[PDB]
RNA sequence: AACUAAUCCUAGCCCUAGCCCUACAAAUAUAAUUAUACUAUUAUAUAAAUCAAAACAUUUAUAAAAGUAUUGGAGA
RNA sequence: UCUCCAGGCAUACGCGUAUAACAACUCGGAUAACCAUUGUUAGUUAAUCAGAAUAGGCAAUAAUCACACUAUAAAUCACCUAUAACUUCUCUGUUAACCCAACACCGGAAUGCCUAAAGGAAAGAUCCAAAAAGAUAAAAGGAAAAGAA
RNA sequence: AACUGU
């Protein structure tokens, strides 16, 4: 879940459970050359790779062997008619084996 | 997780969320609804409506029977505190 | 409120990250001794980065501590420290700490204290020597490096001899 | 100026009766227009080790009024040898045991190409072992001892009886005993405690053991025997031989202690090393005696013999200790017998790289003024009790 | 499953995919609490596939078939949340009377404005939390001049508003 | 140049290393004095009980290295006693050199790539690699071991080839010294060696790998480490003999390696036939490097009281066979 | 009838009148906008001078009675 | 493929998409070609590379291959004793011909490796003006070699 | 002083 507040943990505190997930992910054809078992995903920047591992394993029942994630910087060179820089939204690319 | 001394990460299992996934097998509710399906008149649930639907019948029956007292208000559903529940309405202590 | 760089819990004679913790109260009665004449060994005369004069490591009995070095202080010397105020003057060797009542008139001294229990504040620089101008009963006159001749009680502690770099004033 | 007090620190309304001043406690934050509230101690609801503070020694339940003086590796005795003798109630005989000297007199004991193999090992231990041009004592000093032990251990071919002993890894030796009513404890570690199934042969006869009664422990006024020892008020009474009970080799043959500090100021003096060895060697022997004969205080009918070797990779110290008495409460009586060989130089100097002076190779990559006698003395201790 | 991230193989290459109306709020309210939780994931799964398909379309520089499908799902997903939130809000008010799930209060900043400050949970209390005390919730004396300026600024805005209306009125006469 | 980790968790890691090295890994052991084998068990039983139950040492502060530290101590002791017990039977071991956690280095080029961007766009650049390994223990001798198969031996099993670049799999190129090292300097007389001992960390151990679902890769982790260490180590000796890619070895370089996960023990044999992996030197070479490895096997079952139960001599026999083997 | 150019009417403003006023998420004063401990936490002096006195020094405003008396280097 | 030139590669700092493919040929490059411009899409993958408990007790002796050898310019937490905790791999950085100098500046810019295997092109075309600038050469002479005052 | 296209 993104854009939400998570409970602070103290010693002996309850296990963290997300009953409804706001994370939305997109499977993308590999831009680079990757092994066939490897799968690329565009995921929210606040998601952890463990969350993706749990996300795929639980919601989609997909077995995962390895995960590699990268952050792609969004170009801010573009400017509008007023000469105000336009920033491409940064996205996280996750390589899941 | 928490980073200990020497800047070494130590994952806290409690702080790592566990995705509770509902069982969608046999569930008739789907991404879309037919254009055939007529819309229902919106009746949002409120504290008064929830009290009327759930709490009012119990108190009404007890009041007529005479078995109503201030000590047993929690019996009708009052929670003096939200502590102890996995989901606390206030302060909110659970993720969506 | 500033974090002290002298963060060592215990006084030590080893260089401290180096800086050596100096002691300007010469007569601190060390363990297993009475408040009476006791002797210490000048183990090594090293240089203190945080002080102008070079420090002499004085080790006696069960306690080791750094101190400022006098003109002739060198490694392996034996230095005496006495608190007893004898009826007659106590034998004085260069650099030894005794009450001004013990010291004899005219001896060059250093690391003197203006008031009893104040601690050494004058003649701690290189080449500075205070002359014991006069001595009577429990009173003595010490010429401090500021050129102020001051009279103090005999309880004040004076170390005989000039400070190291004896010819500092003679530098040309 | 001498400052009394750490130099670091240097460069109505409430009393009124009938009403209480208002404070920003309700605000939950400081505001200049409200008085400072009085805050009671905070309760976290759980115990945090990060913010937990160890209680002072006196508050501890294990606190004991009597002070227990504990000696460890870093402890350095002010009097060195003299203090160690008094604490351990031992009598010192200069040189190694007569038996040990005779062990290497046998030609079979001498290793084939012993000097050459030692020379090669020293060169390997200093230069060839690592890719660094000039390895430091922190590295080569542990290695040279291990290589020499292996070279000595290779003699199992000549003497199969050497298979009866094995070397542990930094076992812990500890004992507690009283000297003239002074509570003394020695805590020791490090070494490989070479242990054999049988005790090392007794060096001194019972008549010599009784002769030690004449010997008197030297005293050093005014300094106390407990100087340089860690004064402990929270302690537990323990005797440790370095192994749990049932160990196949209950008898320790040798106790090795190495000083690999590269810098001389970081290196303990040879006298201090032997003093540390004496206390540590004494503790291990005492633990064996207490286990065998219980906690009773008496003259030992069968002395316990243990050895210790201390080296920094260039200087080698050989120590042999025989425990003759367990009645250590008194300062006079039967005394333990210790044989000491000190300042045995394997080599005066070693050049880790070829030394070219005036375009001439004055010094090769090898030990300078190498003394094979030191290894022979080392070999004598290792083979003692087998050959 | 991986296949769930993708559309029906038959639907691939189609101009559009036949889909119905989005879930309305009342129908979701009629559904049970457990059903609502189950539905959200079902709604989400289609959204991810549509989002998954859309990104591939962006990579291929191709249009997304039946883009209204994604909007319908989002409407269904959004309607679910309010219904679930409404039930949570009703129970919270009854048991505690709090109109907000998170503790909060109105506080004055250093600029003299009054803003709702949401309280934060801390492992330590505020009085032993020096940093929290370091945080400023008080207005300086000089802000009184700013407050007067703010009142004057509001009056100026109304005066400018009348000027804006006057110019619009002129053209109304000119146009008509 | 790429920085290669001998022990890695990558899928098909053994295949990846073989492709860069041109090593063929045949499953099983290579084609081929009594010492009271029962006595070794009793001696080894005491050694296991010695460290686990008898030796007294300060507890580690971390509390996580305790399991790893214990495994190292028992393995070292068994090795130490084994050398002494085997010394009377084989005098070669007396002259042999045993290395404790010393590093093996090797540097070689396999594959190529074209720079796609930058000031050097379009220039062809070879893929540079480096393996630095520190085997738990290894035995170095001054005489080459008996060859396990004749030079130029060809088998149907083929070297792997990697679809993706080494970068795609986690492997990062860094500029630093190129090193080829046998575990000791060229000055050291022992320019050959018998066996290598490896201890796998907890992260790569069988229990974690099975939990991670990479149970099949447990052998791959075993295979990758063995192939990396032996090839890197064996190649250095041939370089110490003057042989390089264009001066490929005239005699195959052969040796053994054992990898243990703390409980299971695996035995590996490597023969180095080709020093030519550069395109120029490999342009004309029919030889291939051959590796023979055995699956990991438990050495004992459990430690009860002061008596270890279920010790497996079969693994011990392989160690006995390795220790007794000497050059012909 | 030519290229460069030019053409236009509202964007809004201004002054009085009237009126006072009392109306997403997430992150943040730590280093503001850094999801949880550190480190206690904080604005404001006669209003002056410039200026006038042709400089400059005390000094120099900021309904009728009446700009009168008084005051003032009796001068601005 | 030929002729010729000879500081190259990493990290730090800074920059922030200038990266790459495609499509454009107007504007930007201090002129074009060609793109560094314009538009579109892609990119940089980390358990290993990089960034992000407490209280007491107690420490004399530089380095220089540290040994000898001296010296003056003066140069070294640990470990013990207790208390407390009790099974961990996430987050973030990763592209580029790049930065500070108004610029695709001429200079400014920390460190390691290495000196060509790395990295490059002085020629927009034609003519062979004079004059001017730089370089080389001198019959005989030598201020109209490097020594003295 | 020599030296050299100064």
UniProtKB/Swiss-Prot annotation, chain A:
Keywords: Mitochondrion, Ribonucleoprotein, Ribosomal protein
Primary location class: mitochondrion
Compartment annotation: Mitochondrion
Signal peptide location: none
GO molecular function: structural constituent of ribosome
GO CC annotations on file: cytosolic ribosome; mitochondrial inner membrane; mitochondrial large ribosomal subunit; mitochondrion
Top-rank taxon: Eukaryota
BP-aspect Gene Ontology terms: mitochondrial translation; translation
Protein family according to the UniProt entry: Belongs to the universal ribosomal protein uL23 family.
Oligomer and partners: Component of the mitochondrial ribosome large subunit (39S) which comprises a 16S rRNA and about 50 distinct proteins.
Full protein name: Large ribosomal subunit protein uL23m
Lineage: Eukaryota, Metazoa, Chordata, Craniata, Vertebrata
Portion of the full sequence shown: 2 to 98 of 146
UniProtKB/Swiss-Prot annotation, chain B:
Gene: Mrpl41
GO BP term, pick one: apoptotic process
Main subcellular location of this protein, as a coarse class: mitochondrion
Record flagged with keyword Ribosomal protein: yes
Domain of life: Eukaryota
Keywords, sorted A to Z: Apoptosis, Cell cycle, Mitochondrion, Ribonucleoprotein, Ribosomal protein, Transit peptide
Function (record text): Component of the mitochondrial ribosome large subunit. Also involved in apoptosis and cell cycle. Enhances p53/TP53 stability, thereby contributing to p53/TP53-induced apoptosis in response to growth-inhibitory condition. Enhances p53/TP53 translocation to the mitochondria. Has the ability to arrest the cell cycle at the G1 phase, possibly by stabilizing the CDKN1A and CDKN1B (p27Kip1) proteins.
Whole-protein residues included: 40 to 135 of 135
Disulfide bridge partners, by residue number: none
Species this protein is from: Mus musculus
UniProt similarity note: Belongs to the mitochondrion-specific ribosomal protein mL41 family.
Location in the cell: Mitochondrion
Protein name: Large ribosomal subunit protein mL41
Swiss-Prot record, chain C:
Region of the whole protein represented: 62 to 257 of 306
Keyword Cell membrane found: no
Family: Belongs to the universal ribosomal protein uL2 family.
Keyword field: Mitochondrion, Ribonucleoprotein, Ribosomal protein, Transit peptide
UniProt organism field: Mus musculus
Subunit structure: Component of the mitochondrial ribosome large subunit (39S) which comprises a 16S rRNA and about 50 distinct proteins.
Subcellular location(s) per record: Mitochondrion
Regions crossing the membrane: none
Record-given protein name: Large ribosomal subunit protein uL2m
Gene Ontology molecular functions: structural constituent of ribosome
This protein's record includes keyword Iron-sulfur: no
GO biological process, one term: mitochondrial translation
A GO cellular component annotation in the UniProt record: nucleoplasm
From Swiss-Prot, chain D:
Recorded GO MF terms: structural constituent of ribosome
Coiled-coil region: none
GO biological process, one term: mitochondrial translation
Keywords associated with the record: Mitochondrion, Ribonucleoprotein, Ribosomal protein, Transit peptide
InterPro entries with a match to the protein in the record: mtLSU_mL37, Ribosomal_mL37/mL65
Keyword Transit peptide: yes
Regions crossing the membrane: none
GO CC terms of this entry: mitochondrial inner membrane; mitochondrial large ribosomal subunit; mitochondrial ribosome; mitochondrion
Compartmental location: Mitochondrion
Pfam families: PDCD9 (PF07147)
Keyword Mitochondrion in annotation: yes
Oligomeric and partner information: Component of the mitochondrial ribosome large subunit (39S) which comprises a 16S rRNA and about 50 distinct proteins.
Family, similarity comment: Belongs to the mitochondrion-specific ribosomal protein mL37 family.
Name this polypeptide is given: Large ribosomal subunit protein mL37
Lineage per the UniProt record: Eukaryota, Metazoa, Chordata, Craniata, Vertebrata
